[PDB]
């Protein structure tokens, strides 16, 4: 049996309503609902479509029935965002799981700030170099690095990665870094980091020279 | 109502298994339990059930015949026995208890179980320190360490605002992690700030100090 579930993901304001879905293969025996907030095990949100677990908040609605079932929020709150799974029982294995719907909190768009760090000298005498960027409380999420080597770009051995949203600000960050042989990054004196954003046309530029530092 | 799942690792691949679920707090002879597994990939996985009795068991169509559910009712515990081990196994995996309608209320911790070939190596910590003035913007590089997960704390974990910590991401064999911290300019580097990492399957503690530096 295949659950479905629309969006995959979804940004909501706060003081908005939202609904979410989940689409069954065949007509389903029970339907329940899950929250995951990461870092921590689902927690019981909704069981027999309609009933509410002990509190959770008035504003969540289950509804549905044959193969349509929906979650709905009256009005968006901040801690309200979280991974929500439906999730079903027919009365015969397999018992079967939504992929889930991932629900962001909107925010006013924000800029990144960007800082570069230079290998380490433990690192070097370890005999390897790695140039790290943070690109820190930004909206929204999608974004962009480029490398520059002595003006030239680099694609090559740069690892990424992005946090969830942050829990005050609600932004997101991403961590660049650029791995090099000591010998190799002793090869050029310039190393860029340039970051792009809807927030601006003109890219954010950080850099420092091997020399100097 | 508790349960406690424990017994997770990291395993050969073809190898065996075996975790427990300890549940305090109901009476336990009284209710079903299954097993679900978690990979970020896959997302939420049902694994197994048994009955109360025992007398009724459920597989998934998956883990059928290298995986065995079962009960200790005086204990209070429940098992699940893995063998013949695959990479898509590897999983967080949560104990739960059956209710009527089948949902689960009541959910363990988890405990991870990695499958692979790969060796455990330990991690080596770089300070990140700023280049050559009314913020500072500070880092650990945590990298060449396996398997997950690995635990970032700045200062002992007394200070926690300001700081991002990123998932780390693996690279042939070996994952990188790193994390950021900001702190006025008053405070660093007046006061110190350290990075302390853990890693676990090593038994690696190490603590790294940032220090500005010149020649
Ligand atoms: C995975 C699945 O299919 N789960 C469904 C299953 O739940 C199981 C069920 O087990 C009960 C339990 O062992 C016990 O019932 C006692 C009490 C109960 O403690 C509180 O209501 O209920 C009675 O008073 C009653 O009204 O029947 C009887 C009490 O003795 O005993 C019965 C035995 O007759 C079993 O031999 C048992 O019910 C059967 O369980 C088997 C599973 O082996 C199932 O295949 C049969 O169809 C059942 O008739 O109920 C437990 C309960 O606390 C929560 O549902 C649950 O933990 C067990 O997993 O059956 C549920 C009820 O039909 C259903 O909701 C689940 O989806």
């Known amino acids: 049996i295949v659950l479905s579930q629309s969006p995959a993901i979804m940004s909501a304001s706060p003081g908005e309503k939202v609904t979410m879905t989940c689409s069954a293969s065949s007509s389903v025996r029970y339907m329940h609902w899950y929250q995951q907030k990461s870092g921590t095990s689902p927690k019981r949100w909704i069981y027999d479509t309609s009933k509410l677990a002990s509190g959770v908040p008035t504003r969540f609605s289950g509804s549905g029935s044959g193969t349509s079932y929906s979650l709905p929020i009256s009005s968006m709150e901040a801690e309200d965002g979280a991974s929500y799974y439906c999730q079903q029982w027919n009365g015969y294995p397999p018992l079967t799981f939504g992929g889930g719907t991932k629900l962001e909190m909107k925010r006013a768009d924000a800029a990144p700030t960007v800082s570069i760090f230079p290998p380490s000298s433990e690192q070097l005498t370890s005999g390897g170099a790695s140039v790290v960027c943070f690109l820190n409380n930004f909206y929204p999420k999608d974004i962009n690095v480029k490398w520059k080597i002595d003006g030239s770009e680099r694609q090559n051995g740069v690892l990424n990665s992005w946090t969830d949203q942050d829990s005050k600000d609600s932004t997101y960050s991403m961590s660049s870094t650029l791995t090099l042989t000591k010998d190799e990054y002793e090869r050029h004196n310039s190393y860029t980091c340039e970051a792009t954003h809807k927030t601006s046309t003109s890219p954010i530029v950080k850099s420092f020279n091997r020399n100097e530092c | 109502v508790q349960l406690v799942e424990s017994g997770g690792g990291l395993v050969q691949p073809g190898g065996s298994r075996k975790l427990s679920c300890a549940a305090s707090?109901?009476?336990?002879?009284?209710?079903?339990m299954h097993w679900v597994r978690q990979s970020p990939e896959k997302g939420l996985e049902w694994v197994a059930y048994?009955?109360?009795?025992?007398?009724?068991?459920y597989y998934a169509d998956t883990v059928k015949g290298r995986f065995t559910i079962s009960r200790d009712n005086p204990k209070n515990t429940l098992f699940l026995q893995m063998t013949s081990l695959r990479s898509e196994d590897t999983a967080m995996y949560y104990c739960?208890?059956?209710?009527?309608?089948?949902?689960?209320?009541?959910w363990g911790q988890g405990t991870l179980v990695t499958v692979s070939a790969a060796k455990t190596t330990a991690p080596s910590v770089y300070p990140l320190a700023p280049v050559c003035g009314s913020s500072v913007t500070l880092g650990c590089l945590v990298k060449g360490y396996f398997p997950e997960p690995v635990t970032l704390t700045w200062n002992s974990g007394s200070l926690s605002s300001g700081v991002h910590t990123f998932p780390a991401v693996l690279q042939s064999d070996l994952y990188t992690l790193s994390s950021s911290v900001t702190v006025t300019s008053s405070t660093w580097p007046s006061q110190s700030i350290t990075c302390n990492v853990a890693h676990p399957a090593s038994s690696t503690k190490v603590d790294k100090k940032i220090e500005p530096r010149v020649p």
């Open positions: 739960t208890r059956d209710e009527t309608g089948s949902w689960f209320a009541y």
């Open positions: 048994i009955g109360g009795g025992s007398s009724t068991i």
């Open positions: 707090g109901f009476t336990f002879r009284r209710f079903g």
